Amino acid sequence: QQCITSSQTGFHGGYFYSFWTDGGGSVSFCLLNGGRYTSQWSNVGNWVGGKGWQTGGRRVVSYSGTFNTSGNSYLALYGWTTNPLVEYYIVDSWGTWRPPGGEGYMGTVFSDGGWYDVYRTQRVNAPSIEGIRTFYQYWSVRQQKRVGGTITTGNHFDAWASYGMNLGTHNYMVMATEGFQSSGSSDITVSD
Amino acid sequence: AQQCITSSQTGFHGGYFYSFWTDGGGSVSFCLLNGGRYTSQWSNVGNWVGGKGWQTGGRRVVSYSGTFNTSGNSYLALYGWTTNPLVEYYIVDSWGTWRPPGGEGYMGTVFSDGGWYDVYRTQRVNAPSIEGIRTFYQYWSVRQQKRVGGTITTGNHFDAWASYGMNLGTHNYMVMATEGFQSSGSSDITVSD
Amino acid sequence: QQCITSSQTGFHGGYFYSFWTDGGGSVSFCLLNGGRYTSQWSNVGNWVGGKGWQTGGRRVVSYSGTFNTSGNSYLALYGWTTNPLVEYYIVDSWGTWRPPGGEGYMGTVFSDGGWYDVYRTQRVNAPSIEGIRTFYQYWSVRQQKRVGGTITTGNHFDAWASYGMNLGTHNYMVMATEGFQSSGSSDITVSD
């Protein structure tokens, strides 16, 4: 199995992957050698996915490749925790909109040669690795767009905890591409 | 349990870590009081530094309140060490007749807890340290205007330092400290998270 | 009767008075003959006021009357100095909380037939006679409650100095009632 179009998770090239779309528009998601994946999307509704780890946590994430979009998309390390349920994002780059639009500004953190702005925002009755639930989103968003480098998750998690943003048991953690009502392409290789 | 002490030591008192150090020059009294509270008095001292806080430093919102007076060269600063590498670090809120570290090694600024601080890096050559005689960097945040009392958000300082290429090792101790060099004065300091 | 509800200062009965509330809940402050005032508060945020002297200092203050609260209020000689800025209290009685909750104990002093415990505490960016400022508070608090007696201010000032608690140029000094998220009433007559 190589290119796919329906929400799923699994293992490929020695890495975990997760891919989700609300089915709106079209997105193709390709599983290539090792930590590599490519993505292409057109007038998509909402989608997010990449390669990484079934169990998240403190890790030096190295990633490389390309990311392009005529609209609202981002490139982020992306993960979940349970107990409590958190959806989190370390956004290295974006398109026409810098997430999460400045809402829930908490402060700053400096990691992997760059400044990130820290935000908390909320989802009420939204899809989640545990169903329709209400949960917090934790954001680090680089101040300048970058595509390629290391992401020391630990620094983000320590910063978040210092701002009162506590994480549960780690679910998956992937170097993700994301689309909202947009078009673009991505070609990303993850490793330790 | 001891209350006032005059010889270098470390320990736990009032549910807090404390560190107290003096080279033995002149006179310094360091008094362990309830909870996060310590007092100090020094007269014509050589060099001393101590306070209450935590055996392991890290990103923390440090609340302190109290008094600090000197006729000489003394300061009031969140104080700690990392190993691997070896770093002595200061977040100086107040000082006496000498604003440390005397302009040496300016890197930039950082705004934290309602105040501007200047950032500096300096070096100590075969000097006393938590790993004996060693060579190591000192990292500084120094408030532009003297404050005694308030909160030190250490993350803002640790972030700003790393952005100026000043990288911390593994956290050793972190205390709300009083320091005196060839000086006299007193302090009364209560620390909390 | 001249009763007021809005923060202010002036002269009445040949005494200075001060009255301040943050405006939370209800407080009536009534200026009566000579050194007498009454107060009445319900579900108040924070208020303090009484009669006394526009210029504090070494004085034998005598006061008589009543003081009742269902919560956290007190009865104290109350003043300010500038250069440095200090807010100070000689507390004879309180309701449910003995101020200042043990914080910053310095020692003791015997004045006017009673032991007081001496405390120094600090207010960082807080309401004061100069505006939002950082300043120290000096406390003498009676070991046993008393409503009515003499307060020899010099005995307190001399003990504070002995503990390194130094006073500025005297602003006002009044025999005050203070409420904090409380209800209660006072009737106090001040003299030399």
Side-chain angles (χ1 to χ4, degrees):
Chain A
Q1 196 163 210
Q2 178 163 79
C3 304
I4 62 171
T5 60
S6 63
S7 311
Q8 63 193 79
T9 61
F11 300 92
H12 188 266
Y15 287 86
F16 178 83
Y17 69 93
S18 172
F19 166 72
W20 177 94
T21 175
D22 64 3
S26 69
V27 43
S28 169
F29 184 96
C30 300
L31 303 166
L32 303 186
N33 314 61
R36 183 167 185 208
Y37 77 85
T38 78
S39 91
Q40 175 161 236
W41 62 101
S42 198
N43 211 351
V44 82
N46 191 208
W47 92 273
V48 56
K51 289 188 168 195
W53 295 273
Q54 160 160 237
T55 312
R58 304 185 72 84
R59 194 183 287 275
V60 186
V61 179
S62 207
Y63 80 97
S64 50
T66 66
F67 165 75
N68 300 276
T69 177
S70 42
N72 179 24
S73 309
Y74 26 98
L75 186 63
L77 192 88
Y78 172 72
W80 291 84
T81 65
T82 56
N83 209 235
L85 182 58
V86 185
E87 189 181 34
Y88 74 74
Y89 292 106
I90 301 141
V91 184
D92 266 10
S93 177
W94 62 95
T96 62
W97 189 73
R98 188 172 182 268
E103 179 200 339
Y105 180 80
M106 299 301 280
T108 57
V109 53
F110 183 90
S111 189
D112 309 283
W115 286 100
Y116 295 74
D117 295 321
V118 178
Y119 309 86
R120 180 166 57 210
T121 71
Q122 196 173 40
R123 300 287 292 167
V124 186
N125 299 310
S128 93
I129 56 165
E130 282 185 343
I132 302 295
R133 306 268 135 120
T134 296
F135 57 92
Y136 286 128
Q137 309 182 289
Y138 298 171
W139 304 84
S140 286
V141 186
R142 214 167 186 281
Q143 285 185 342
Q144 270 95 86
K145 290 174 195 196
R146 166 186 88 157
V147 174
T150 70
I151 300 181
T152 310
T153 60
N155 300 347
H156 293 277
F157 298 161
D158 294 345
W160 295 347
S162 80
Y163 292 129
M165 301 154 61
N166 305 123
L167 286 165
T169 305
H170 278 293
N171 208 282
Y172 69 77
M173 199 177 69
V174 292
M175 200 52 216
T177 315
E178 220 264 15
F180 197 92
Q181 294 180 331
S182 77
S183 329
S185 66
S186 102
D187 180 340
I188 297 301
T189 311
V190 73
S191 61
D192 197 78
Chain B
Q2 62 222 132
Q3 179 165 257
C4 301
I5 66 171
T6 67
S7 67
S8 313
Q9 62 180 60
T10 66
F12 298 86
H13 182 282
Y16 288 87
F17 179 77
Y18 70 86
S19 172
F20 166 72
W21 181 88
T22 185
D23 65 0
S27 305
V28 42
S29 186
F30 183 93
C31 301
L32 301 174
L33 280 63
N34 284 353
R37 191 163 172 201
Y38 77 88
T39 79
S40 75
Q41 192 167 311
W42 65 102
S43 146
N44 293 351
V45 91
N47 193 201
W48 90 272
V49 67
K52 277 185 176 184
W54 301 267
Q55 193 172 212
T56 306
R59 291 188 96 91
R60 182 179 293 274
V61 176
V62 174
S63 170
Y64 81 98
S65 68
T67 68
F68 167 69
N69 299 280
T70 181
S71 57
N73 180 11
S74 300
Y75 27 92
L76 180 70
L78 188 82
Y79 173 75
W81 299 82
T82 67
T83 54
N84 209 247
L86 191 52
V87 178
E88 191 172 47
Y89 70 74
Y90 300 80
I91 300 165
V92 187
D93 266 1
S94 195
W95 63 93
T97 58
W98 185 69
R99 183 161 185 274
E104 201 199 312
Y106 176 83
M107 308 296 267
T109 64
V110 58
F111 186 90
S112 190
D113 307 281
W116 282 102
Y117 293 73
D118 306 313
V119 186
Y120 306 94
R121 179 178 60 200
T122 71
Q123 178 175 60
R124 295 275 296 154
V125 209
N126 311 103
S129 86
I130 59 166
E131 283 174 337
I133 291 275
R134 285 281 225 93
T135 275
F136 56 95
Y137 290 108
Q138 299 177 310
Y139 300 168
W140 307 80
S141 280
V142 182
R143 203 172 189 279
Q144 287 182 343
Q145 264 102 95
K146 293 196 194 186
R147 179 188 73 169
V148 177
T151 69
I152 302 183
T153 300
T154 62
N156 292 337
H157 293 281
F158 296 172
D159 285 334
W161 300 350
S163 89
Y164 296 127
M166 301 149 74
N167 295 128
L168 289 168
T170 309
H171 280 294
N172 209 295
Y173 68 71
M174 188 174 82
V175 291
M176 200 50 215
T178 310
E179 167 146 26
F181 192 87
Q182 289 192 301
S183 78
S184 303
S186 68
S187 71
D188 176 353
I189 299 289
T190 300
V191 80
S192 63
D193 179 270
Chain C
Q1 170 106 130
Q2 187 139 175
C3 298
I4 61 175
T5 60
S6 95
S7 300
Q8 64 185 92
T9 63
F11 301 82
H12 185 288
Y15 289 89
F16 176 82
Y17 69 92
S18 186
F19 170 62
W20 176 91
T21 176
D22 61 7
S26 209
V27 44
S28 168
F29 180 92
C30 300
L31 305 155
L32 309 190
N33 290 348
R36 183 181 190 189
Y37 74 87
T38 68
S39 70
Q40 181 194 315
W41 61 105
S42 198
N43 287 80
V44 88
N46 197 200
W47 88 275
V48 64
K51 290 184 155 190
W53 297 269
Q54 173 169 232
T55 296
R58 303 181 74 91
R59 205 182 273 281
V60 183
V61 173
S62 175
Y63 82 94
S64 62
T66 58
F67 163 74
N68 289 287
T69 192
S70 52
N72 176 9
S73 310
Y74 35 82
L75 184 62
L77 197 73
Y78 173 77
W80 292 89
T81 64
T82 57
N83 187 41
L85 181 69
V86 187
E87 181 189 40
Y88 69 82
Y89 300 83
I90 298 165
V91 177
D92 261 8
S93 191
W94 58 89
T96 59
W97 187 71
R98 180 162 191 267
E103 188 191 332
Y105 180 78
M106 306 285 298
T108 65
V109 59
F110 194 75
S111 205
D112 313 290
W115 282 105
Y116 299 68
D117 301 313
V118 180
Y119 306 85
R120 174 183 57 203
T121 67
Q122 187 179 36
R123 294 278 285 168
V124 193
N125 282 290
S128 90
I129 50 151
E130 274 171 355
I132 301 292
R133 296 287 146 107
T134 285
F135 56 96
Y136 295 105
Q137 299 158 312
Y138 302 169
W139 307 83
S140 282
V141 189
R142 210 165 189 275
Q143 297 191 334
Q144 268 77 49
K145 298 199 190 190
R146 167 184 91 162
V147 179
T150 64
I151 300 185
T152 305
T153 62
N155 293 355
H156 297 277
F157 297 168
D158 290 346
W160 295 351
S162 87
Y163 297 123
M165 303 162 67
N166 294 125
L167 282 174
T169 315
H170 279 289
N171 207 278
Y172 69 73
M173 189 177 79
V174 303
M175 191 60 211
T177 317
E178 169 143 21
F180 190 72
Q181 296 181 336
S182 68
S183 318
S185 73
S186 71
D187 183 348
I188 299 298
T189 305
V190 200
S191 35
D192 194 48

